[PDB]
Nucleic acid binder design. Structure first.
Lengths: 136, 172, 106, 190, 197
RNA sequence: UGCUCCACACAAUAUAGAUGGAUACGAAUAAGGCGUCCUUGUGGCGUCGCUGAACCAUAGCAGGCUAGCAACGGUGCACUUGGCGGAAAGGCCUUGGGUGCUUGCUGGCGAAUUGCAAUGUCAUUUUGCGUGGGGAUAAAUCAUUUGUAUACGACUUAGA
RNA sequence: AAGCGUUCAUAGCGACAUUGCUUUUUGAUUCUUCGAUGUCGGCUCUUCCUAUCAUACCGAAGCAGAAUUCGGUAAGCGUU
């Protein structure tokens, strides 16, 4: 007696959609969609991350699941307070996506002696877990 | 050149012994630098008054940028565009953030829509639409409705390598 | 360990050349994974060697070797220009040449 | 032009259940069930209360947005195939030689045959699709009723009759002979 | 990075796939193409036939046994899209075609090895959504190649055997991940998390 | 004392190009993967993707010697039980045992003179002389001839 | 599309024009060969083109059927 259909959830484009810029002078900072121009150009502001409030083509940014409500056509300070109030940044870092990007760059910075540590460290975690597989 | 800038221009006839202190015409010009703007001024005053730049002079040149250069707004813009077999007036309404950035878009798509280069486009007047519900283009009114929400499906993904291994997804 | 290379691999592309003219003076090299001339200068300037096997030994090694220096970036894809003390025999098209890490610049 | 959004409403009566993943649909109701592919439409489906289905397109061109109305006109056609069914009552009009059709089973495969058409001995067997049942409407002369759920298949069969009885090499406009659909009805009257 | 890569052409533009393969050959990469029957070409299938018959008719007149050999196999029609696509006349080009092995379907032993793909030539990424694409698996059947059924069951046989391979792999993959989490949170991982792993 | 195949040299030439690892579902993408759960699905719920920058592995005279500790593993090496696999299978996987190494941990031992870098060589072929074992013991052609064949070839014959 | 075509401009047409293609005609010219490229027609021999004569399938009509005429895909098959 039940009809089943799947909405196939997307990352919606709206004023209040937290975004990640990909390429350009920023190239990796966070921002909120201030106001859309068209399907290919929006407005972004980065008061929490130093990104100047600007209009950018979507091609240089990628959307995020993050969601928070704030008025359209807002100003920088208005963006800031809701950004601080909703605690978007901290829960952004709480996203598994944030760790992956961070450890990616954390990996890009680790030095040779750190590399040698992991060489040993990976073998320790190897042996400890391998015996468990052997016991399994 | 499309990185245009609105160079405001004032120009006047050369002083003459009969009538000095001439009329001092003024114009806003959309151009990629000071230089093209200077002559683009001269092109327009070449039309509406009996003056050539040799017989006239440019009293001043200055730059223009919007008072709130990061505020979206709707533009009502007139233009005459030289057709393949003639010329027609033309009234588009484009919604862009900067006055110049509107023309950056407008010169681009007019070249797309009717193959009119930057050469023959004569912006009669740019009129930023001061309020809503007064435009008459549906593709803009659909951006004037409330709570504009929609997905961007079928996301493209650039690849820095010629090879992948994932059969990449497309969800967005 | 199991790897002993202290160089980064390099696939030799081709001559420095126009449509219908080629120049043996300069040859093009691609390093795996290198992307842009923004970070191609890291490989720029290093001594690079073309190792190959000869039918008969000459000087205590059947493995004769060719010496050359990578000079400058090329294009926007990380291809670099390299001059060799002896120009490549043009059989090297698609051959993996070694890209040493010296002269060090760090 | 690419309207950023376009919307259509699917009115599903309470007697029909719907299952849609990807672009494959399957209704379930008292009449039966129907399954149809839509892999070539590029649309989106969503729901309000399991009575209204909301189909939509985002950023679709004019040629694209046309299809969005079509599929709604397709899926509700699915409903009527499973809440009403489609009745196609036919007419055997002929000038002098009456039309004879033979409900005949060749070998496990049902075909409807056209005989006596213009006194001709052509074995004009025509296949009949699934769920499409053939019944001679009694008490009224020269009708055949094609009953089935899928409007497409029942109509496609009836269309096949139109062409298979098509008189040739004659000025048809007065050779009014042949087979013709009197009405595009429904299995139930509601 | 891998000298010999099994490239899969599923949902890949034949032209775009050709170039990203034309390059790799001339760089010297060993290239083996698989699943070649169901490659994709952009255009309506009916018109994809017409342009072939136009090419099919094109042949030398005085001796039709020495003109352009109009190959029909899906692998070979792709292969022709590599000749001319690569400077075949010269020896270097001849060696390039030497180091290329186009293999319709998935013949052994590549089935038991990884089928790399090309991000660039993908139909999903490149085609505007809703545009008319065309698989060569049906075209070659429509234009003379006569082995659609035999490869259909053969690929069917490989897929059902391979699926079990993955089913066995997922079972072991589950247990290694389960042991991973079980042994995780340990102080060793704590350095790894801080260090970058 | 011919020939072939198994082991080894070694000598030759020969290399369209080894110098960590082809690290194996399919399908779809306006959708899935994975995991949990079941009123088993076109299911519930959750996670995830947004680049292979990943996974493994990787420390030791170019990878030597020696001792010990926590274990019952990895891991060669071949053996062996088997299975799988005919699309070009020629490989995959598994049982069990032995073997060496183990850097999981601690120690100790030797590294030097190529003297400031000089690829500082480490592969993959095939043959040829031979090592020292295995296997095995024929055809074809000319010439004679037959014609279903034929310009000549060729073909088709027959002939201890 | 003026008119014919009973009535109806466009079934068939189609005046007055007007826009294309062709080298199967013949033009104009002289780029090629004057220290030789054998020149008509016929015989026979074959392929190709379609701008279709019949042939397959259709459509139209001032096409009752036949004969019809126009038109479409069509060069496979023929054309004494």
């Amino acid at each position: 007696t039940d009809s089943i259909v799947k909405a196939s959830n997307w990352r919606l484009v709206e004023v209040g959609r937290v975004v990640l810029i990909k390429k350009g002078q920023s190239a990796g900072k966070l921002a909120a969609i201030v106001e859309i121009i068209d399907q290919k150009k929006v407005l972004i502001d980065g008061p929490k991350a130093g990104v100047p409030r600007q209009a950018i083509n979507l091609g240089q940014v990628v959307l995020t699941p993050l969601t928070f409500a704030l008025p359209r056509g807002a100003r920088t300070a208005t963006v800031s307070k809701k950004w601080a109030a909703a605690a978007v940044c901290e829960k952004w870092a709480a996203s598994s996506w944030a760790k992956k990007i961070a450890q990616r760059e954390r990996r890009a910075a680790l030095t040779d002696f750190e590399r040698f540590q992991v060489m040993v460290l990976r073998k320790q975690k190897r042996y400890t877990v391998k015996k468990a597989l052997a016991k399994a | 050149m499309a990185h245009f800038k609105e160079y405001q221009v004032i120009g006047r006839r050369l002083p003459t012994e009969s009538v000095p202190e001439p009329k001092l015409f003024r114009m806003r010009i959309f151009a990629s630098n000071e230089v093209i703007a200077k002559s683009r001024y001269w092109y327009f005053l070449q039309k509406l008054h009996k003056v050539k730049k040799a017989s006239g002079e440019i009293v001043s040149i200055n730059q223009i940028n919007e008072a709130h250069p990061t505020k979206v707004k709707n533009f009502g813009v007139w233009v005459r565009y030289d057709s393949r077999s003639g010329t027609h007036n033309m009234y588009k309404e484009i919604r862009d953030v900067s006055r110049v950035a509107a023309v950056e878009t407008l010169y681009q798509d007019m070249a797309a829509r009717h193959r009119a280069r930057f050469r023959s486009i004569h912006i009669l007047k740019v009129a930023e639409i001061e309020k809503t519900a007064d435009v008459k283009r549906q593709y803009v009114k659909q951006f004037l409705t409330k709570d504009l929400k929609f997905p961007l499906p079928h996301r493209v993904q650039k690849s820095t390598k010629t090879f992948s291994y994932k059969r990449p997804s497309t969800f967005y | 360990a199991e790897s002993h290379r202290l160089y980064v691999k390099g696939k030799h592309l081709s001559y420095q050349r126009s449509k219908r003219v080629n120049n043996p003076n300069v040859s093009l090299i691609k390093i795996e994974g290198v992307a842009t001339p923004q970070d191609a200068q890291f490989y720029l300037g290093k001594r690079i060697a073309y190792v190959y096997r000869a039918s008969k030994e000459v000087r205590g090694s059947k493995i004769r070797v060719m010496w050359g220096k990578v000079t400058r970036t090329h294009g926007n894809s990380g291809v670099v220009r390299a001059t060799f003390r002896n120009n490549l025999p043009a059989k090297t098209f698609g051959a993996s040449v070694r890209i040493f890490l010296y002269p060090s610049n760090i | 032009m690419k309207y950023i959004q376009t919307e259509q409403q699917i009115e599903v009566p309470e007697g029909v259940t719907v299952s849609i993943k990807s672009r494959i649909v399957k209704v379930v109701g008292p009449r039966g069930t129907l399954t149809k592919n839509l892999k070539h439409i590029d649309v989106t489906f969503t729901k309000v209360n399991n009575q209204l289905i909301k189909v939509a397109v985002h950023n679709g061109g004019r040629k694209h947005v046309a299809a969005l109305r079509t599929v709604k006109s397709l899926v509700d056609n699915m409903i009527t195939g499973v809440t009403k069914g489609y009745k196609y009552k036919m007419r055997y009009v002929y000038a002098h030689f009456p039309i004879n059709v033979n409900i005949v089973e060749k070998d496990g495969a049902k075909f409807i045959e056209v005989r006596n058409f213009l006194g001709d001995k052509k074995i004009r067997n025509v296949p009949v699709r699934d769920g499409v049942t053939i019944e001679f409407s009694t008490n009224v002369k020269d009708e055949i009723v094609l009953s089935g759920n899928s409007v497409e298949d029942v109509s496609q069969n009836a269309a096949d009759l139109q062409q298979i009885c098509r008189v040739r090499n004659k000025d048809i406009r007065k050779f009014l002979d042949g087979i013709y659909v009197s009405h595009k009805g429904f299995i139930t009257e509601d | 990075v891998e000298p010999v890569v099994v490239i899969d052409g599923k949902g890949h533009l034949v032209g775009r796939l050709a170039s990203v393969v034309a390059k790799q050959l001339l760089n010297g990469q060993k290239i083996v193409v698989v699943r070649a029957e169901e490659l994709n070409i952009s255009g309506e299938f009916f018109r994809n036939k017409l342009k072939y018959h136009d090419f099919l008719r094109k042949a030398t007149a005085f001796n039709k046994t020495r003109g352009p050999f109009h190959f029909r196999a899906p692998s070979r029609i792709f292969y022709k899209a590599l000749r001319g696509m690569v400077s075949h006349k010269t020896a270097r080009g001849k060696a390039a075609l030497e180091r290329l092995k186009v293999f319709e379907g998935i013949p052994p032993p590549y089935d038991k090895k990884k089928r790399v793909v090309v991000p660039q030539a993908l139909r999903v990424l490149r085609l505007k959504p809703g545009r008319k694409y065309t698989t060569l698996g049906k075209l070659s059947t429509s234009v003379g190649w006569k082995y659609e059924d035999v490869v259909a069951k053969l690929e069917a046989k490989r897929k059902v055997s391979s699926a079990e391979y993955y089913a066995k792999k997922r079972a072991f993959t589950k247990k290694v991940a389960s042991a991973n989490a079980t042994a995780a949170e340990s102080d060793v991982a704590k350095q790894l998390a801080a260090l970058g792993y």
